[PDB]
Design an enzyme around this catalytic site. Structure first.
Site, PDB file in Angstrom:
ATOM      1  N   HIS A  41       0.789  -1.221   0.116  1.00  0.00           N
ATOM      2  CA  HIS A  41       0.125   0.035   0.015  1.00  0.00           C
ATOM      3  C   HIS A  41       0.815   1.188   0.094  1.00  0.00           C
ATOM      4  O   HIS A  41       0.176   2.250  -0.158  1.00  0.00           O
ATOM      5  CB  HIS A  41      -0.978   0.109   1.067  1.00  0.00           C
ATOM      6  CG  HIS A  41      -0.453   0.244   2.581  1.00  0.00           C
ATOM      7  ND1 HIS A  41      -0.436  -0.871   3.494  1.00  0.00           N
ATOM      8  CD2 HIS A  41      -0.229   1.170   3.057  1.00  0.00           C
ATOM      9  CE1 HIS A  41       0.232  -0.454   4.615  1.00  0.00           C
ATOM     10  NE2 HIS A  41       0.218   0.991   4.588  1.00  0.00           N
ATOM     11  N   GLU A  72       0.950  -8.377   0.962  1.00  0.00           N
ATOM     12  CA  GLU A  72       1.196  -7.009   1.247  1.00  0.00           C
ATOM     13  C   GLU A  72       2.535  -6.690   1.415  1.00  0.00           C
ATOM     14  O   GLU A  72       2.705  -5.461   2.111  1.00  0.00           O
ATOM     15  CB  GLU A  72       0.316  -6.909   2.638  1.00  0.00           C
ATOM     16  CG  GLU A  72      -0.019  -5.355   2.979  1.00  0.00           C
ATOM     17  CD  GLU A  72      -0.490  -4.344   1.940  1.00  0.00           C
ATOM     18  OE1 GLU A  72      -1.235  -5.117   1.052  1.00  0.00           O
ATOM     19  OE2 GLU A  72      -0.305  -2.926   1.862  1.00  0.00           O
ATOM     20  N   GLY A 146       1.351   5.828  10.827  1.00  0.00           N
ATOM     21  CA  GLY A 146       3.056   6.136  11.248  1.00  0.00           C
ATOM     22  C   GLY A 146       3.811   4.783  11.232  1.00  0.00           C
ATOM     23  O   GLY A 146       4.978   4.870  11.125  1.00  0.00           O
ATOM     24  N   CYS A 148       3.471   1.717   9.782  1.00  0.00           N
ATOM     25  CA  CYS A 148       3.434   0.990   8.672  1.00  0.00           C
ATOM     26  C   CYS A 148       4.856   0.946   8.056  1.00  0.00           C
ATOM     27  O   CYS A 148       5.505   1.872   7.968  1.00  0.00           O
ATOM     28  CB  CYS A 148       2.483   1.116   7.679  1.00  0.00           C
ATOM     29  SG  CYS A 148       0.782   0.895   8.138  1.00  0.00           S
TER      30      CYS A 148
END
Ligand SMILES: COc1cc(C(=O)O)cc(OC)c1OC
Length: 182
Positions: A41, A72, A146, A148
């Site tokens: 992402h 992911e 913040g 990730c």
């Protein structure tokens, strides 16, 4: 404060950079040579900022399992003039549960941040922001925006990167040794 934080600090001090995309600033784990990982992402493009240096992306691959389900994890090769310490020998070979993990973050917003998250569950399937995702690790800590890309470690193992949360739990994508065979 203890041996878990000692291992985490050793990983942060030598194997992380600050990555900036159009989607934000992320903790980015360097694994070997010029190869790093970041949450998918982050939407890595042809150019990325690495510690505020404009850097060409040589290759980026958004990983999916053999059921063709999102993992992911994006693996990035950077046109950088310096290699990372090789830490592939700290990656687990198999999906597992863990005790006593630390989540470490280093950005402009959250410098030198370390969180003892405790027990880590092999959660498996998660609907992550509407996207069916596999190989998710879960910990009972109220992680926030913040964090990730934050590194999840135990003593002696680098087990995952933080990809999300629901206000009460945090979720990491597994790192496996087999992702980084060259
Ligand atoms: C300070 O903690 C460690 C750091 C490293 C490293 O090579 O960075 C290797 C370790 O295992 C031998 C550690 O203990 C678990």
């Amino acid at each position: 404060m203890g041996p878990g934080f000692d291992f985490a600090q050793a990983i942060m001090k030598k194997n992380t950079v600050i990555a900036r995309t159009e989607k934000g600033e992320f903790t980015m784990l360097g694994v070997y040579d010029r190869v790093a990982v970041i949450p998918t992402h982050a939407s890595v493009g042809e150019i990325i900022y690495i510690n505020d240096v404009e850097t060409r992306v040589l290759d980026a691959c958004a990983l999916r399992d053999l059921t063709d389900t999102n993992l992911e994890i994006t693996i990035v090769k950077l046109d950088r003039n310096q290699k990372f310490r090789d830490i592939r020998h700290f990656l687990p070979r198999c999906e597992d549960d863990y005790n006593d993990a630390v989540l470490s973050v280093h950005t402009s917003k959250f410098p030198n941040m370390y969180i003892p998250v405790g027990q880590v569950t092999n959660y498996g399937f998660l609907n992550l922001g509407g996207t069916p995702t596999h190989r998710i690790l879960m910990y009972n800590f109220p992680t926030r925006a913040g964090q990730c890309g934050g590194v999840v470690t135990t003593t002696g193992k680098v087990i995952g990167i933080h990809v999300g949360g629901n206000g009460a739990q945090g979720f990491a994508a597994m790192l496996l040794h087999s992702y980084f065979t060259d």
